[PDB]
Amino acid sequence: VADVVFVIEGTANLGPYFEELRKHYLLPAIEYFNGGPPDFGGDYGGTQYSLVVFNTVDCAPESYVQCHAPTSSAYEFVTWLDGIKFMSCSLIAEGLSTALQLFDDFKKMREQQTHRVCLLICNSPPYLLPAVESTTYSGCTTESLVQKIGERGIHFSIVSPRKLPALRLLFEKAAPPALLEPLQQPADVSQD
Template sequence: MAAAIATTPRQSSISTPASLSSPTFAQHNSPQIPMPHPHRKEVVCVFVVEGTAKMQPYFATLFEAYLEPILRQLRAPIITDGDEKQAKTKVTPILKYGLVVYGDYEPSSTVTVDRKYFTSDFSLFHSVFKNINCSQGGILKNAVYEGLVAALELFDEYKLNAEPTSSDPIFHCILVAASLPYNMSVRCNISEKYDRFGLSNIVEEMRKVCFELHNVNAKSTKLTSPLRTMYKCRWFPRVKGSMSSKGCLPWSTTRRQRLTK
């Protein structure tokens, strides 16, 4: 059972903002997904999700209406380039799910950022996602930058622990947000590499690692406009009532931390 950790520099919290101890992913593979080998392509995806009271009205419909269509595309076979001796082939990807839940800075949220490492067990990931408790903050000091830096740190650790024989993974980052970001350099990072990172630093680093970025906008089209402008990420309309998932496509890069049940 994970415990909440206070918001201090280079510390990670293991509890979802405003919740009791949340499940975490154990490092294991589901029976349907084989272990990685040189001829399989790994698709590594981090979901960066706002877990505040401002997200609560939209949260129930987010997964089915927006995130499942994205995941279906990420699971689709990848066409590998051929050459004179070898024809193009379809490769079924191995999908790895990571999760970052961020809130506001204290005291609005008890926990500012919660990181959970990758799992290939979709049922476990889905269960943990559905149990995010959106009940605090989302008004003044929203820590979206902390969430994005936590995703970068997950990517870093994933690369560090990858098998030497593994092919290069494809990284995706999916930001699900409802509040305006608080414009302050990060202070909850674990790695010194990200000390004092602001928006421009985050965008520059994301460009290095991520294949494509999805932004699911749960409230306002002005929500994360600086990120949208600087990264030119794929942008989805506000979430309300019954949402259309048309046009949902993949986007960015990720790395490591763990979810456990």
């Protein structure tokens, strides 16, 4: 219980749309996974969760990622919701690998397993067509998807906007039960 993960990518594509996306989808992430509207003590028991943020590789001189949410005491994540950065493709795969390694570290040392689930959020239809020339990972977004879903039993998900990206077709490789068929027009489900 109280397990979530956020991955924001649609900065340039959903700059203004991010407010409505939060008002319609980010509220149940706290309303359902907690008692209600969030100051509480922060522990390492597993009740905490993570949140990763990634930007466009093109509109970036040298920096890649700025992930910061080890525990967040389930409120510090609510603190830096509006503390996002803004920047055409996006090449988000290099940022999905960050969440991959993060949940790998979680399963490696933070194992008390609460089967922490992960959710991705994008507005542009990204693709890191060059999957090479990286630091500690040389896989594509489909390989990352099948590794995070098939190899790792971590529940994957991607909350797309009203439009139709390609990830809605890439969902077909989600071998574990993701429950991404019905859209969350009512309160969001723990497994999207």
